[PDB]
Amino acid sequence: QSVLTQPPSVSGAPGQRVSISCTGRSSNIGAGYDVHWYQQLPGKAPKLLIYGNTNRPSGVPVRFSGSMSGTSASLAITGLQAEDEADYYCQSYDSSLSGSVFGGGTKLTVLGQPKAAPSVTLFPPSSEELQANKATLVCLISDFYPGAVTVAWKADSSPVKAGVETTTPSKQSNNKYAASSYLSLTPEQWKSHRSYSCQVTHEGSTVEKTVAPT
Amino acid sequence: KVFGRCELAAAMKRHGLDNYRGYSLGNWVCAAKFESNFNTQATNRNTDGSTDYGILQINSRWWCNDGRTPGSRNLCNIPCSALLSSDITASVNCAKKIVSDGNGMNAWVAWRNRCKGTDVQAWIRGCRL
Amino acid sequence: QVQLVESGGGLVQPGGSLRLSCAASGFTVSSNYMSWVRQAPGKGLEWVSVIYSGGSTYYADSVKGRFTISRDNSKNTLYLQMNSLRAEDTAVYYCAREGRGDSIDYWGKGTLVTVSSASTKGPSVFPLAPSSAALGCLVKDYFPEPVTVSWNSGALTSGVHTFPAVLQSSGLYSLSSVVTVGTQTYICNVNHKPSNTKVDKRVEPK
């Protein structure tokens, strides 16, 4: 992913004509070896999008087109759609390396999608876990767009930083995101407070879930 | 000389290209189609000043001498004109050496783009071989 | 119809050896161009190796000498024998069928290969009892990834949500699976294959 380069990110608006460049060299594109393109949706294997610079396999919409000129290739999307949000990869053959080569990949972003508030569910430590001398507070965040959330935990009213483990938001099967936060406590720490709170901030908008020992 | 596909398949078979270095006869016929259109006399200038010669479009920068490619190597130790004969012996012998370089049949840009991974047996299908 | 199924993936120690398999159906592996493509977590696609229809083999410089691509006609399977495995060989390995000009026609689902000195660790499963409705299971402190959480051996798939796992300070993973709904029996079937952990949990309101 070094002899073929791509921009790491490309951002477009709905209906916009955008393009993703694939910069090669004399040992690959320059030599005349055709460029192939792949679209990789979250949690999926890649799928062939364009083959032999310009050909579209069956099932690929007409808004996808490819072009090649000199030492570079271009993947063009005319009339950008929310469903096109994915990672895009160019691929060719390099005579200096004697094998197939991929570009570094381009994360395509479609900016104009409806902003989705995070669905927040907080769970207290289970009885079974407390019997094992452990306490885990589980704060689950789903169906949110864009994919940037902050998690703040509270012990009664004072904020807590220790034992906090939060995942980076990752894309679901619908362009909305999923995130999780875990608060690791001892059963003694858990019972020493009247309540614990999970504070999820998404777009200045704050949502709070509260659990208490019982 | 412009070969017919079955006539070339027959010639390439007699010259020992069927499964040579792991490439079935169909690969060599397909490569010759997309390189020269089965024309032994085909010549094509490259933008680096080199020229491709014959039925398998063998390049003067590495494999043959055409006396007009400064920085050329002549690895097949032959004048490029010898690759233009009606008899494919010289082109077959230089192709056997080329396919043994680090890239296999990918040395032929057209074989990689047009033939590799396709039904190459279609190029010899129907020929009484 | 055309199918590519990878297996043989998992945890191995550095300097260790692992053999990946890719059982194919819908075509003859001996008559096709087959390749292996890998993807390190959160990274790009990296071409590993290829076997031609006529048997020629090619490798990425990063795996040269250490890896061997092969195929068996009897079993219609493609193999990837990996030796002297290193931390950087950690990736999701894809079996691939090539089309025209080394373009890839079909891909498998991928198999995770983790090259680490850390030991396999089965998870502890805990019920996330309904509000006193959303209820689920906590799949705590496991290594390596992945884990599958089914409901009544697949019977329930409707309204389920298994979340991506957190990589804790301890180097162990934890994840949570919910389902939006005291009469029916909910049994979160957790399955962590690297440690044989197959558990059937139970979530009623406490």
- Given C117, C142, C167, the domain boundary residue is C117
Handedness of CA B13, B15, B16, B20 (dihedral sign): negative
Domain match, C1 and C91 both: yes
For residue C10, the enclosing domain spans 1-117
Domain match, C107 and C134 both: no
A37 strand-pairing partners: A50, A90
Measured over all CA atoms, what is the biggest interatomic distance in chain B, rounded to whole angstroms? 45
Cβ neighbours for C5, distance < 8 A, ≥ 6 positions apart: C22, C23, C24, C95, C108, C109
Asked if C16 and C115 touch (Cβ cutoff 8 Å), the reply is: yes
What is the 8-class DSSP label of residue A189? H
- Rounded Cα distance between B106 and A95, Å, is 8
Q: What angle do CA C190, C196, C199 make, to 5 degrees?
A: 30
Categorise residue C152: left if φ over 0, alpha if ψ from -120 to 50, beta otherwise. left
Domain match, C91 and C8 both: yes
Asked if B78 and B115 touch (Cβ cutoff 8 Å), the reply is: no
Domain match, C126 and C206 both: yes
Question: Residue B69, CB half-sphere, CA atoms under 13 Å: how many?
Answer: 21
- Rounded Cα distance between C13 and C20, Å, is 16
Closest to C11 measured CA to CA, from C122, C112, C142? C112
Asked if A10 and A18 touch (Cβ cutoff 8 Å), the reply is: yes
Cβ neighbours for A55, distance < 8 A, ≥ 6 positions apart: A66
Structural domains in chain A plus CATH codes: 1-112 (2.60.40.10), 113-214 (2.60.40.10)
Domain match, C86 and C147 both: no
Length of chain A: 214
Say whether B66 counts as a known binding-site residue: no
Asked if C54 and B19 touch (Cβ cutoff 8 Å), the reply is: yes
- Rounded Cα distance between A78 and A84, Å, is 11
And the tokens for A53?
């610079």
Domain match, C193 and C104 both: no
Neighbours of chain B (3+ CB pairs under 8 A): A, C
- Rounded Cα distance between B121 and A204, Å, is 64
Domain match, C201 and C125 both: yes
- Given C74, C91, C117, the domain boundary residue is C117
Q: Alpha carbon A1 to chain centroid distance?
A: 20
C197: CATH? 2.60.40.10
For chain A, say whether B96 makes contact (Cβ under 8 Å): no
Buried b (16+ CB within 10 A) or exposed e, A136-150: bbbbbbbebbbbebe
- Of A52, A128, A165, Cβ closest to residue C126: A128
- Of A33, A52, A129, Cβ closest to residue C126: A129
Residues in chain A whose Cβ is within 8 Å of chain C: 1, 33-34, 36, 38, 40, 45-48, 51-52, 89, 91, 93, 97-105, 121, 123, 126-129, 132, 136, 138, 140, 142, 165-167, 170, 178-180, 182, 184
- Rounded Cα distance between A200 and C144, Å, is 29
Domain match, C152 and C179 both: yes
Q: Alpha carbon B4 to chain centroid distance?
A: 15
Handedness of CA A82, A107, A41, B114 (dihedral sign): positive
Question: Residue A26, CB half-sphere, CA atoms under 13 Å: how many?
Answer: 3
Closest to C8 measured CA to CA, from C139, C145, C113, C146? C113
The string of DSSP letters for chain B reads -B--HHHHHHHHHHTT-TTBTTB-HHHHHHHHHHHHTTBTT-EEE-TTS-EEETTTTEETTTT-B-S--TT---TT-SBGGGGGSSS-HHHHHHHHHHHTSTTGGGGSHHIIIIITTS-GGGGTTTS--
Cβ neighbours for A71, distance < 8 A, ≥ 6 positions apart: A23, A24, A25, A26, A29, A30
Length of chain B: 129
Q: What angle do CA C179, C124, A160 make, to 5 degrees?
A: 80
For chain B, the straight-line distance linking the first and the last C-alpha, in angstroms and rounded, comes to 21
Q: Which residues of B are catalytic?
A: 35, 52
Tell me how many domains chain C contains. Answer: 2
Closest to A38 measured CA to CA, from C25, C106, B119, C75? C106
Q: Give which of C3, C126, C161 to mutate to test A binding, by max A Cβ within 10 Å.
A: C126
B17: CATH? 1.10.530.10
- Rounded Cα distance between B108 and B54, Å, is 13
Domain match, C140 and C187 both: yes
Q: What is the dihedral angle through the alpha carbons of C168, C94, C5, C27, rounded to the nearest 10 degrees?
A: 170
A90 strand-pairing partners: A37
DSSP 3-state percent helix, strand, coil across chain A (nearest 5): 5, 50, 45
And the tokens for C87?
């931390």
- Of B23, B27, B116, Cβ closest to residue C102: B116
Tell me how many domains chain B contains. Answer: 1
Handedness of CA A24, A29, A33, A36 (dihedral sign): positive
Chain B hits for C32, Cβ within 8 Å: 117
- What's the Cα-to-Cα distance from C21 to each of A118, C36, C69, C71, C80, rounded to whole Å? 41, 11, 10, 9, 7
Domain match, C135 and C153 both: yes
- What's the Cα-to-Cα distance from B32 to each of A30, B81, B115, rounded to whole Å? 22, 17, 10
What is the number of CB-based contacts under 8 A between chain A and chain B?
Answer: 19
Cβ neighbours for C14, distance < 8 A, ≥ 6 positions apart: C85, C86, C87, C115, C116, C117
Domain match, C158 and C131 both: yes
For residue B99, the enclosing domain spans 1-129
Chain C hits for B21, Cβ within 8 Å: 56
Residue of C nearest to B99 (CA): C56
Residue A84 CB-density burial (10 A; 0-12 exposed, 13-18 middle, 19+ buried): buried
Cβ neighbours for A150, distance < 8 A, ≥ 6 positions apart: A200, A201
Length of chain C: 206
> Which amino acid, one-letter code, is at C102?
D
Q: Determine how many CB atoms are found less than 10 A away from the CB of residue C129.
A: 17
Q: In units of Å, what resolution does this entry have?
A: 1.9
For chain A, the straight-line distance linking the first and the last C-alpha, in angstroms and rounded, comes to 55
- Given C61, C91, C117, the domain boundary residue is C117
Domain match, C102 and C123 both: no
Handedness of CA A143, A149, A154, A160 (dihedral sign): positive
Q: Which residue has the tokens 């992945």?
A: C146
Helices (H) and strands (E) in chain A, counts: 2, 18
DSSP 3-state percent helix, strand, coil across chain C (nearest 5): 5, 50, 45
Residues preceding gaps in chain A (C to N > 2.5 Å): none
Residue C157 CB-density burial (10 A; 0-12 exposed, 13-18 middle, 19+ buried): exposed
Q: What is the dihedral angle through the alpha carbons of B22, B23, B25, B31, rounded to the nearest 10 degrees?
A: -160
